[PDB]
Symmetry: C4
Subunit: 388 residues, 4 copies
């Protein structure tokens, strides 16, 4: 077995093609299925897995009530092959109310954060063993990506934050080999607030697009130099911004450098990635709520501030249906590294109060250099058919 280097060029993409869907909520009305949120996808070579933070209960179960307390000690990181819904045979890989996982080519790394808000612990589990742990540096919800980390030549990087969700916080970028923390770099550069980073390999380095929960409806970007541990940061240039909430398209802005001070707080986990001067990005359709999901390319959107010329739009979820978090993962093909993304389809609270629980299903799409059509792939459950 060999370490992944991801040393191929990024695939050409013309858009995205449907890849996977788990139908979790529909199934939960006639089967024992885990209550989850904050899902993601990561792959051991070409074999892809779905992950989520469990609420320590199934859906048709009185313990499903009030999974709006985001951090309890019952929460565990679930891991199944992609497309296998979270049934009762699902492995709980670690104790976690925040996580990130990734495979280095030889084994799985899981970063799992649990415990008290003011004094949390992160456990680093590598090839099934507990190798390292760190306590909270700012005593205010030590927390991480909720999507895949990335490893290059045996070194894995993960972004973590500790401190305020609505003011300056303390973000650090960890470098980890075989589960062991070998270096920690504080955040540097012009990003002013970092949450829930969606990271990808850009060989020899890593790049992340995150969520600013303080002043920005434009998404921050982090560049992680794997050879010297140097961090820089800025904001995606596109004037079509990726966060929710945000201004409408005619009055949204980004200068590439600073938070835009437009509906800055709070936010939603999301992603984008560069292709030369252009950016491919997803976002909720609604500017206000986590409703709908669309992807498009912004011409000049990576290098020209305030660019708003989109092309290759695709609806992933129509705006009559609920979305949620979204994130990037990468898959190395024969000749190029592809980019894929998942969308969390949140059902139940706070937007659907008939039920008392909150859970999600997923839909997943991957980059394509071929052709495609149109559609919409929402959760599909009828809230009136659900146990409450």
């Amino acid at each position: 077995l060999e370490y992944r280097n991801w040393s191929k060029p990024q695939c050409q993409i013309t858009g995205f093609a449907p890849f996977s869907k788990d139908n979790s909520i529909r199934l939960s009305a006639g089967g024992d299925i885990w209550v989850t949120r904050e899902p993601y996808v990561s792959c051991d070579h070409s074999k892809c897995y779905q992950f989520a933070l469990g609420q320590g209960t199934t859906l048709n179960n009185k313990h499903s009530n009030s999974t709006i307390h985001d951090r309890t000690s019952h929460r565990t990181l679930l891991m199944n092959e992609l497309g296998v819904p979270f049934h009762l045979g699902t492995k709980q890989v670690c104790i976690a109310w925040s996580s990130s996982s990734c495979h280095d080519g030889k084994a799985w790394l899981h970063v799992c954060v649990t415990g008290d808000d003011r004094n949390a612990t992160a456990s680093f589990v590598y090839n099934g063993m507990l190798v390292d742990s760190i306590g909270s540096w700012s005593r205010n919800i030590l927390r991480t990506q909720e999507s895949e980390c990335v490893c290059i030549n045996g070194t894995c990087t993960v972004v973590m934050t500790d401190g305020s969700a609505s003011g300056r916080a303390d973000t650090r970028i960890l470098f980890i080999r075989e589960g062991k923390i070998i270096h920690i770099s504080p955040l540097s550069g012009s990003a002013q607030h970092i949450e829930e980073c969606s990271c990808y390999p850009r060989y020899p380095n890593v790049r992340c697009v995150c969520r600013d929960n303080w002043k920005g409806s434009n998404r921050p970007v982090i560049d992680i130099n794997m050879a010297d541990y140097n961090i820089n940061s800025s904001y995606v240039c596109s004037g079509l911004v990726g966060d929710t909430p945000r201004n409408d398209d005619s009055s949204s802005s980004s200068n590439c450098k600073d938070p835009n001070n437009e509906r800055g707080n709070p936010g939603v986990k999301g992603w984008a990635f560069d292709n030369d001067n252009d950016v491919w990005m997803g976002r909720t359709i609604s500017k206000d709520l986590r409703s709908g999901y669309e992807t498009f390319k912004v011409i000049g959107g990576w290098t020209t501030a305030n660019s708003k010329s989109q092309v290759n739009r695709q609806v992933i979820v129509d705006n009559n249906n609920w979305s949620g978090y979204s994130g990037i993962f990468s898959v190395e093909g024969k000749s190029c590294v592809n980019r894929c993304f998942y969308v969390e389809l949140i059902r139940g609270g706070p937007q659907e109060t008939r039920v008392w629980w909150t859970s999600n299903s997923i839909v997943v799409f991957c980059g394509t250099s071929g052709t495609y059509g149109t559609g919409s792939w929402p959760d599909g459950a009828n809230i009136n058919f659900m146990p409450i």
Copy 2:
């Protein structure tokens, strides 16, 4: 690992022997089992899998209602080892309301079609990665085999149609290596309408027997030359025709060349295969409805128009029980390539209106050169014992 070539002669067959049965509907009355239709079987060397298009729900689940809308965004391709019913641990391999899968000797290819009727996407998933995609060329339900594709020396072929279900359409034959489309040949020859092809290796080439939904109750045949991408087509010679609906045996015909204009529309997915001048074929027992299932050999049925001398008949399902789609798969033994087939046993709508759902079980038989007796292997559920 090496590519399959299937370069052995076809096995001698005297008829078929019982191979597999999943009892899906019986179990659905006391267990959480997927609602499915359009099943098939395909094997990774000798290890055989059952596939179907899920309806995004289990049977005992209010979401089971009205799975007569054949194409929704909840539909996913399920894949289990043959004989493992579609329980909640079943992997949803792709998003699909039409599919075909096959193993090239090194990995699995899935062809998955989803999205809007007028602008569908097909995704090509190979070894678990999205490698290619194509959009609809005629904007009218891009669709494929609902049974296994076939690969020879690393090149896989699949038949797809886009356009009218009851008039001339646009059928193309794709050639795919490691998930990538390398060539596309339009249909050519005298077949006038193609649906739901049942294809098999006939080394060095592939042969398919399909469904004509327009003018033919005789089944069209497609020959796919793997070395030069040349396509020819015609109709099975046998005067005992394989489609449903059809004329009764005394007044059914086929000239080997054209649709017979006997009860031409619609049809049912089915199969047949050649042995020298004779044809082995299945069909529903009823000429009108998808009831019963029988197999037999027609002497001269491959090369002599209107031949009606059958022999070696076997009842698979008696005519008091529901059948459905059927298809071919091939299995390479020590010395010869065998032919096998599955029958979809459809329960619920439209023929059984007590329930509101529609789902299926399967029975599976393989060619034998030994001896055998008689029986009937229907679904076996009692519709009055089912949740509605």
Copy 3:
């Protein structure tokens, strides 16, 4: 991978030690568990599997009613790792209302009989492929061991019967290589009626102890010469006889040669094996009903007619609890071939009429050359706690 030869001496045994128990019926009152009967155990090297004939339904399911019609087309052979109860993820390996399985060192052989009573088919499935089939030779319930077959150097032998259950029938011994029947020897010697053989390797040959359903409460024995296909047969010498029904111990007999004409019909599947002049054997405790289960050694019981001096008795199931079929399997250890046995614990019909179904759990014991104590390991379900 290499063929099993089983070419080590039989282990010394002082009795048997507890090995496995599945608790199937207890679990069926709070879980979806298959209705089964006729279980057995066979091992791929040291990895052991449990097998049974399913009734095409779970227990808490209205289709569980009247599983006293022993042969229907819903019956399939289930196969799980030993100790894994028959949950909804269980693989249905073939269509079968009678079976035998065995592993040749390279792959699994399953012999599966289904279809009409008067014209049944047996399918021979090897490494997951249908390799051969035979039809009924006497048109009266072609049927087989319901326990493991045995393979030596790539040749597997299985005993089958076709004809009367209460008069002379036609028993044949099949020799099968890679799923293909290569020879068939009619039964020969003094056994007069053969059912449900429990067979084991006695290198270079195989030996079986069966059930006589016609005139014998003594068990018949079959010796199968693997080098020349020669069959001989006789009866276990022990005057403590192994069938049920039988005379009480003071008035039971066997002359080693003929059926004893004591309560000859019907019978129960069982086992015994030789150790020099002595026999180790199990049997129901009750002489009349399938209640209780005991093992013991009979001194001179292999070679001296009417020997009744037992020693090393063990209760497996006390006589207040239901038993059922029992059978032998063998496991090769470091230095010797061990003998093990399972007992079917039948619950529900005809002895427990509160429920309408009939199903079983299992208990399993293996030979030991160490020491042991006492106990009783019955099914343990409370019939009043079961769905009906």
Copy 4:
């Protein structure tokens, strides 16, 4: 494959980090989950498994009643990957109302004890085969560790007791190679009563910390010399004692040598391990009941009698929540052997009489040389949401 030697130094530990949690009881309110008690953890290299003694039933099942009869013939040893709750697909590895398991680097050893209290049998299952068995030597509940055994260079050791739970008994230490007992050493030294040992590798030997159920609330220690089979024994020096019941911290004692005669009977399974002159240990928070769980290091606690200076305390379960048994397991990392522990979280009888059953969930922590914070990780079920 090679035998484990565990020949690396013990890892530095600063405390423990969260590792695993199964949420068994919460899930049992909305899913079919095994009723268990006496869980433990053991790992095949870095791949960790959870084990427990099943009660032959799921929780939502009328058979769940009165699982306070600790030893019945329905009890089996369950084995799943760590973090996979005991769902209906769980394998029952042996028949057991007391057990110990361990992996020698090549295969799994299970020590399983079942049968009558006065004449029990222990079965020794290695690589899936029954290799040996021993009967009861004192005819009074032959019994063992309820946590992992330990193997060095192919020889596995396990501690067993037979005789009184409240007076002198007969404890022996078995040495087993490939499932075969090769030596048995009686207990020797100053420990006066041994139950439920928690053992770990201390290369080239093994060390155990057990439960004294007779006169001691200090925990006995056993040292097992693997080269010469020599046994010595004593008591953990710490004046902060590990058993429950016990005196409060101001009046608890231990002289390193004898039972302390402080609330000597009964006890709870627990663990401790040495680091030079200091001891790391867990215990219930309550001195009286199996409530809460804490870990800490006692300075001089290994070598100085009555030392009470603790440091590095961690709450694992707060004192408002139920605990239970706890035990040690060891995991070899790149450079050192780590120590981990599990806590059984018992719900239902006798402390929670609303329900009629008794079952448990688990939480699991591993040693760390990094940093960490605080929290509490109790079972988390609401007893009023459970079926009774």
